[PDB]
Design a protein around this nucleic acid. Structure first.
Lengths: 191, 121, 408, 36, 228, 143
RNA sequence: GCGAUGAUCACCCAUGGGUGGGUACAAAUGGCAGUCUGACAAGU
């Protein structure tokens, strides 16, 4: 019946996603100083950090390199041959090996952060099935944890009435219906 | 020094230092690199006289940027000691600024020397 | 006759009628900039230089000045007879390839702007010849590399990188602090007297990494994390705590969070050291004078180093406390006299009125050292001007300190 | 409350309110006419 | 609240709102390359200032034929920190290209920053007097514009036009008699430089004196004809 | 009442605001546009309407001398009365900025003269027959 | 084959779009917003 694990996990989840996006934008900035056309070729930030970790510097472009950065996700969107061409003919300002080391350490940092986010979300889903399974089955694990964090505790959520849970034509009908059933689910899951 | 590009010849130095001395007596003159930079940012400088044998040259080479950015005439003279004696202070000044005033007795000489500097540029 | 042309992708050579001057006259006088004349004269020998950008740049610099080995291994078999004539446009290149070893005859920048201009016109028709591409990006990247080398851009002097580094340092400190707050109040369900008695985020996370539960901490030693009095303090706290018991799964995830904390702190330290190296590589005299952190903060306030150079000295003295400056100017109070130089070592070494006077003197000498570091076209990168200016400020500080106030 | 009404000063949000504004100009015109 | 009216030159527009403006499009969204204020209406837009760009003064004065169309390649002599060549890049758009040429070093680095932003500008830090020295990177430009303030302006323009310009092309020059002669009548200087260009085979069509925006400045527009 | 620091601050404030206003404003052109015609008969038969293929309003305006083939403000409230009023409001705002700026310059200059005459030198109070007071420092290198 | 474990309850063009508003985050070389004084001081 402790639920502060749920509350802390939610706060950590949203701060973790925001920080993932910020640090991925920073990796985008620095490796765009080195080579901006990759930053406009792969907008996917996690794969961008991985691809920076592979192609640290833009000189190593072989066919085995082609195959390895093809195994990096895929070939079907031409990204491998396109980045070979664009890193052969790029306008990229070259930087130092120390800056390259700091860039790749930063990209490794971002990859580890994304791994931690995935692990934390799975742990949150497990703890939600542990603590409040009816509410989690009713609305959802993430959304139920959002409701619990908005309230303050499962005790607060079950103590409040149904209209307050709602503020926590057939669209309005379904909203009120789901709010009342959510309130009953929180009652049974707390007590 | 090629970085000191407009460097005055002898007669031009003589005219410039005489105008500096009269402007100092009337106190239409601001002395020093920081004070000249402040006058340039204020936009109240008539024109700029710099030294050439300053040790080193960059600490006043920062000035031509602002000088033609606000389109002010500037010139280099050889001796900072000569510039200090002409300014009338006991220390060698490396950069002085004649300010703008038209209720001034030396407006004609100021305009003549400024025109000659501008022609040299 | 042969004619040489420089492209952004390779060196090309074209054979034509041996009376090449009269051929160019026919070109212009029949308006032969068209595909008819270009299919009359497509190519003789192509040589695409390789996919190595440094080789591109050095090859182009040697095209501007001299003759390269790439030109040699192109020029191994231009000829069949002992004498053949070649059209070239650079006169220095003309006498160079006259002086080289094959000794075949060449013609300099003659009337053959006809030839060069027409083949640059319908060089699109030469693109199906050897280079099936669009060389706009080729010329773009080549021009950027050539401009980099002509400006002689040292790869370590990058003020945009130093402002990015200081902003990332501040962001890292903020996010590390909020993650430490999160981890502290998550572990506070198990050991709140520790959460009070220690305040280092890193010592907190290292304790979470070594021990997990209170009596495990009581049997585990904690010498390398904390001193003896504080570790026995947390021994007593572990004896009489108040928190619940944590399952192994929650202990695992809070342990992963603690690992993220200590790795963040280690990376922040490493990045601060990298920033120090960047300051010493970019503006060494200012590092010698004011100190690395305050130098980076001044540059980040000003934006670019050259904008900071264009600023005068008094703005450098009060570069930080601009709010106090403008408010005091409007309401007729006294201006701030420290700003952002206050955290420099010499201003921290002085005291009171000596602090104000040393801030003034050091701001003036900092403007001097800074202008030299920004505008030195060549620079020994030693630290000489900064060191002698620091000596001047040190003599001024010693004199000002020795001068007392009360009549003895 | 709102976000576009959250103003950094109690006097600022007071004069940002409008019913107070018409009441204030009404009563001020009344007392000013009484003064003159 | 801001009406966009297309100018008679393809690429330039006019903002008719509270305060009327001469505007161009953007290719770098959300980045004013020198501090000008940008508008949007959505499509981003960015204003030319006549007091900073001689091309802006010319267009605002009214011009018959400006040979810089969107689908073209234009060469710029003397891009002083690029504050006009960014606007010319946005006028041209990605279909064409612009070769900026600078020699002096600090606006050289400014131009490197701007050309690292935009893909239409390519920078040449080589001095403008030697087309044999920078003859590799540029091929058969369509229009040529000149901002150079050196007294051998007609000769360097004739050299660059002989070595790079497509025949029947467009040549636009900005010229200041306070640089070239600075003691005699500006109209006489303009007749003299026109005679120089006619000697150097440029057939001039128009000239315009940018009087309310600058003092003692003309801009000449002519065709490059009958050459190879 | 006030001080040189306050006047200096206000002058720089108004100078920068006037600069931003002049950057936002728009000035109409006035130039000596010439056209270079080959032959004297074409000089004699030249007309601007045919040379620019515009209309009368389009040729007497110089910004938009649009093609007739290119030809091939009533959206805002009170077009003939309010929009021009707002543009004249912007113009008079810039003008008011400029006059307040130069008045602050005059006050700053008088305060500076008083401060120098208080400050330093060996000065003789000279009066000029236009009634104007100057102070003559004797030539002496200040140490 | 109902219900207290909860029934019922701003504009235009014809259930489609345009105009306005609220919420969270992000960017800005967007605004507030302007960079102090300027020759003497210390010992005898």
């Amino acid at each position: 019946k402790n639920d502060n694990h749920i509350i802390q996990a939610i706060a950590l989840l949203d701060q973790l996603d925001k920080d993932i996006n910020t640090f991925a934008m920073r990796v985008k900035e620095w490796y765009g100083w080195h080579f901006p056309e990759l930053a406009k070729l792969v907008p996917d930030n996690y794969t961008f950090a991985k691809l920076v970790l592979f192609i640290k510097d833009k000189a190593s472009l072989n066919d085995d390199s082609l195959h390895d950065l093809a195994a990096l996700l895929n070939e079907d969107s031409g990204i491998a041959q396109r980045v070979i061409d664009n890193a052969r003919i790029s306008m990229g300002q070259d930087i130092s090996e120390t800056d390259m080391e700091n860039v790749c350490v930063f990209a490794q940092r971002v990859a580890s952060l994304a791994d931690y986010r995935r692990q934390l979300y799975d742990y949150l889903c497990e703890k939600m099935h542990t603590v409040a399974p009816n509410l989690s089955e009713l609305i959802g694990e993430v959304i139920g944890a959002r409701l619990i964090s908005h309230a303050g505790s499962l005790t607060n959520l079950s103590k409040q009435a149904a209209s307050t849970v709602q503020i926590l034509k057939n669209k309005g009908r379904i909203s009120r219906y789901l709010a009342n059933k959510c309130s009953m689910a929180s009652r049974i899951d707390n007590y | 020094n090629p970085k000191a590009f407009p460097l005055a010849d002898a007669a031009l130095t003589q005219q410039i230092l005489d105008v500096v001395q009269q402007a100092a007596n009337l106190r239409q003159l601001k002395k020093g690199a920081n004070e000249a930079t402040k006058t340039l940012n204020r936009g109240i400088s008539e024109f700029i006289i710099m030294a050439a044998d300053c040790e080193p040259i960059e600490i006043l080479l920062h000035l031509p940027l602002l000088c033609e950015d606000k389109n002010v005439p500037y010139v280099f003279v050889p001796s900072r000691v000569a510039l200090g004696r002409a300014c009338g202070v006991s220390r060698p000044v490396i950069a002085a600024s004649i300010t703008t005033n038209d209720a001034s007795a030396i407006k004609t000489q100021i305009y003549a020397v400024k025109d000659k500097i501008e022609t040299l540029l | 006759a042969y004619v040489l042309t420089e492209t952004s992708a390779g060196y090309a050579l074209l054979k034509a009628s041996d009376k090449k001057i009269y051929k160019s006259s026919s070109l212009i006088q029949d308006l032969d900039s068209s595909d008819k004349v270009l299919k009359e004269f497509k190519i003789a020998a192509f040589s695409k230089f390789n996919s190595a950008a440094n080789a591109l740049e050095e090859a182009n610099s040697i095209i501007e000045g001299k003759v390269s080995s790439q030109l040699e291994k192109l020029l191994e078999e231009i000829k069949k007879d002992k004498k053949s004539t070649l059209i070239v446009s650079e006169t220095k290149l003309a006498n160079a390839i006259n002086k080289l070893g094959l000794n075949f005859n060449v013609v300099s920048d003659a009337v053959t702007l006809d030839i060069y201009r027409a083949i640059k016109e319908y060089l699109p028709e030469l693109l199906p010849g050897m280079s099936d591409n669009d060389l706009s990006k080729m010329s773009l990247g080549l021009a950027h590399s050539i401009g980099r080398h002509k400006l002689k851009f040292s790869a370590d002097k990058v003020d945009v990188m130093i402002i990015q580094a200081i902003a990332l340092l501040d962001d890292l400190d903020k996010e590390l602090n909020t993650y430490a707050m999160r981890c502290k109040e998550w572990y506070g369900w198990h050991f709140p007297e520790l959460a009070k008695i220690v305040t280092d985020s890193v010592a907190y996370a290292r304790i979470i990494l070594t021990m997990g539960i209170r009596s495990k901490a009581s049997e585990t030693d904690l010498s390398e994390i904390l001193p003896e009095e504080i570790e026995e303090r947390v021994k007593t706290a572990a004896e009489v705590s108040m928190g619940t018991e944590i399952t192994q799964t929650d202990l695992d995830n809070i342990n992963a969070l603690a690992e993220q904390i200590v790795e963040f702190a280690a990376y922040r330290e490493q990045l601060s050291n990298y920033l120090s190296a960047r300051m010493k590589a970019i503006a060494p005299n200012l590092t010698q004078l004011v100190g690395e952190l305050v130098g980076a903060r001044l540059i980040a306030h000003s934006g670019s180093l050259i904008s900071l150079a264009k600023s005068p000295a008094s703005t450098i003295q009060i570069l930080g406390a601009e709010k106090a400056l403008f408010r005091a100017l409007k309401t007729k109070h006294d201006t701030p006299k420290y700003g952002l130089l206050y955290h420099a070592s010499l201003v921290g070494q002085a005291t009171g009125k000596n602090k104000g006077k040393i801030a003034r003197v050091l701001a003036a000498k900092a403007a001097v050292s800074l202008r030299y570091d920004a505008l030195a076209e060549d620079r020994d990168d030693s630290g000489d001007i900064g060191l002698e200016s620091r000596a001047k400020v040190e003599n001024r500080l010693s004199q000002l300190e020795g001068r007392d106030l009360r009549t003895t | 409350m709102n976000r576009k009404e959250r103003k950094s000063t109690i006097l600022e949000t007071l004069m940002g309110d409008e019913a107070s504004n018409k009441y204030f100009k009404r009563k001020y015109n009344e007392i000013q006419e009484k003064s003159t | 609240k801001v009406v966009i009216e297309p100018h008679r030159h393809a690429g330039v527009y006019i903002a008719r709102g509270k305060e009327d403006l001469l505007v161009t499009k953007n290719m770098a969204p959300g980045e004013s390359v020198y501090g000008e204020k940008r508008i949007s209406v959505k499509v981003e837009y960015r204003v030319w200032n006549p007091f900073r760009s001689k091309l802006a003064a010319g267009i605002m004065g009214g011009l018959d034929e400006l040979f810089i169309a969107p689908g073209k390649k234009v060469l710029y002599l003397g891009a002083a920190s690029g504050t006009s060549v960014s606007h010319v890049s946005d006028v041209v758009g990605p279909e064409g290209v612009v070769y900026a040429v600078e020699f002096s070093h600090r606006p050289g680095r400014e131009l490197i920053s701007m050309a690292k932003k935009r893909p239409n500008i390519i920078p040449i830090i080589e001095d403008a007097r030697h087309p044999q020295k920078y003859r590799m990177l540029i091929g058969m430009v369509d229009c040529v514009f000149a901002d150079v303030a050196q007294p051998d302006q007609a000769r360097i323009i004739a050299l660059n036009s002989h070595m790079f310009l497509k025949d029947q092309g467009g040549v636009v020059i900005s010229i200041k008699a306070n640089c070239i002669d600075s003691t005699v009548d500006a109209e006489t200087v303009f007749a003299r430089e026109v005679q120089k260009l006619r000697e150097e085979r440029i057939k001039p069509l128009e000239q315009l004196t940018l009087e309310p925006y600058e003092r003692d400045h003309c801009i000449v527009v002519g065709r490059y004809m009958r050459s190879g | 009442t006030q001080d040189s620091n306050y006047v200096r601050t206000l002058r720089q404030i108004e100078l920068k605001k006037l600069e931003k206003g002049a950057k936002q404003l728009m000035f109409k052109s006035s130039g000596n546009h010439t056209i270079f015609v080959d032959s004297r008969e074409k000089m004699n038969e030249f007309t601007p309407e045919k040379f620019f293929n515009t209309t009368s309003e389009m040729v007497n305006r110089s910004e938009n001398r649009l093609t007739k083939d290119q030809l091939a403000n009533a959206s805002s409230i009170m077009p003939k009365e309010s929009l021009d009023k707002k543009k004249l409001k912007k113009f008079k705002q810039v003008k008011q900025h400029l006059q307040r700026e130069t008045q602050l310059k005059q006050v700053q200059q008088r305060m500076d003269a008083q401060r120098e005459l208080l400050k330093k030198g060996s000065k003789k109070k000279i009066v000029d027959s236009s009634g104007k007071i100057s102070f003559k420092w004797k030539k002496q290198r200040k140490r």
